[PDB]
Amino acid sequence: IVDTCSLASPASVCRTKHLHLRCSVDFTRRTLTGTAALTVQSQEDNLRSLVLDTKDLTIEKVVINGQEVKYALGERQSYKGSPMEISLPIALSKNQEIVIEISFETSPKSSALQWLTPEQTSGKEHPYLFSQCQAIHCRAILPCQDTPSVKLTYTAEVSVPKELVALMSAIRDGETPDPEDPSRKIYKFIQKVPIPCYLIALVVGALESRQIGPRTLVWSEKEQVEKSAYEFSETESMLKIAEDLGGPYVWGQYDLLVLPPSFPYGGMENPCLTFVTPTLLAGDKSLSNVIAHEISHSWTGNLVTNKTWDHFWLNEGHTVYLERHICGRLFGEKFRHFNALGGWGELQNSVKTFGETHPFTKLVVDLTDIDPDVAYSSVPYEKGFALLFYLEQLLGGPEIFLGFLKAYVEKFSYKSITTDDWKDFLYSYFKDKVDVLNQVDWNAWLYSPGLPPIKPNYDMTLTNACIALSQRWITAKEDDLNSFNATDLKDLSSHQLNEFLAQTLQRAPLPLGHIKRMQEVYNFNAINNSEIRFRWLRLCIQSKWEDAIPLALKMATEQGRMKFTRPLFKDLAAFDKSHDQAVRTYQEHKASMHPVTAMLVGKDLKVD
Ligand SMILES: O=C(CCC(=O)N1CCC[C@H]1C(=O)O)[C@@H]1CCCN1
Ligand SMILES: COc1ccc(Cc2ccccc2)cc1
């Protein structure tokens, strides 16, 4: 009903229908300049003004029907930005529309953008720009109702230096030389499917593409295009599986974009162009589960969207569920349970890090006066998945629940819903099983902190080997280390190898002699898998092995994935032999880190 993260007019007052973006990317000044034409529809009678979200934006003028109108910026409200009130030249009746062209310019401190210098890229000769609007950063790029309760289509014309390429979360609609400047190109984009504004994405740089499917192009710098094309070859197979689970894919194109290492997330479900971290380039497709996850957002998240960020679990919860069904269809049901059981372990970590009582461990959170970037964690992913997984086992198994999910996506397609909307449809769909649903502790699952009230049933086939080897190392004495050998891993996949470290890491610290012996027989230092290397180094740093200090500092700074960089920095700061280096390394790299990551890493290290 009320979006406590937005200062703009609610959807009950007016709602944006379309956005026409005409801007120019200036790497000299690190700014976006142009006009944002918002087609606004009134939701009440005698509407004479509205408020929009902005964050560090410069408003030159606001034109309506070819005339300038009066506008005013309120005082800034911290992360929410500054509200922008506009005086309409006419009063609108209900359902009447008007087009508001706003001339704007971004600040180099835009929390949605990161500007890279040539030395920060692979080619080393051209700059790079990419955007991250989710959750409420789009207001830092252009004025808008920065709330997932409004969905709009958009067309865009972006001007960039001719030697560079621009891509957006839309269907490419041609390129032509800038008629005003021979040194620039203009790339045209159109997104015919209405989306919440947080799915607005832009990227500019020396980008090349490689076709890996009938509807998928992999984009990155020349140095990673081929490496990326192989890593994500399963994309089309996952799109077909996703189509079988959630219905037709309605976005036309599904391209991939591998960004520089400073990308904060593993992936971003930007429509038509998923952004992914280069840390997925393991060389064996072992991390392609993130691709399945991002593909699933084409239904759960982008089609059926959370009305507010309090109900973020709807987006991620069902997305993880779809993702793990896609991997199950590709590698077997036992693999689905293996990952499901592993996700429960991550949920254990998040609750133990926040605390059994922390409000952020609730499935549905109250973000009033809370920066979404500060509450973001695995809770909505795993606790949300555990609920759906719990409901699957409670209502008749995966076949039955997938039927509900497909009907759920068709029921709320192109719309924004709340948790109660989802709960109601669950009761409507399973009307013949309300007696089973009433046995569910909806208050504990949806609004209670800590671990869920009940744990689902997990198959242990693929996990036992991990627990076996993990228990050996934890209980091992000094005269037992000699019996460990590289042969211990001959039948363990990369995922089992990663889960073994996760289980072992839960009982850290280990004796310093155990860690040294582990590297001697297992040689984990030589593994480039970011997931495995991340946990191996955490085990080392937490076990007080000084040799691992430079390794952890290098991984924590040579890439910017918050999943890895934040825990690495925290672990290094808690190690007395590396505390000073950790704070120093952050301070020297702070200026060139991603704006969101730099803020969170500063708070984690208590240097803010
Ligand atoms: O479902 C996704 C991305 C998944 C993503 O990368 N996640 C989610 C938890 C950990 C983290 C990561 O892999 O770095 C998006 C991403 C951020 C908000 N929405
Ligand atoms: C990564 O982008 C997001 C998306 C959503 C949120 C808000 C939130 C966080 C944690 C739990 C519930 C809701 C923050 C950041």
Author numbering: 3 to 610
Copy text verbatim from the article accompanying this structure deposition:
Leukotriene A4 hydrolase (LTA4H) is a zinc metalloenzyme that stands out with unique dual functionalities that include peptidase activity in addition to lipid metabolism. As an epoxide hydrolase (EH), LTA4H converts leukotriene A4 (LTA4) to leukotriene B4 (LTB4). As an aminopeptidase (AP), LTA4H hydrolyzes natural ligands such as dynorphin, enkephalin, and the tripeptide proline-glycine-proline (PGP), of which PGP has garnered significant interest. Therefore, bi-functional EH and AP activities undergird the intricate pro- and anti-inflammatory regulation, respectively, exerted by LTA4H.
As shown in the M1 metallopeptidase HEXXH-(X)18E motif, the Zn2+ ion was coordinated with H295, E296 H299, and the carboxylic acid side chain oxygen atom of E31826. The OPB-Pro was bound in the AP active site with its prolyl carbonyl group interacting with the zinc atom. Hydrogen bonding interactions were present between the Oε1 atom of Q136 and the Cγ atom of OPB-Pro. Our interpretation is that the Q136 side chain maintains the catalytic water molecule interaction with E296 while simultaneously engaging in multiple hydrophobic interactions via its rotational freedom. The loss of water molecules could afford more favorable binding entropies for nonpolar ligand binding, provided steric clashes are avoided. Also, the structural data suggest that nonpolar ligands are likely necessary for enhancing the peptidase activity due to more favorable binding entropies in the active site. Hence hydrophobic interactions and steric considerations are the primary factors influencing what modified kinetics may be possible.
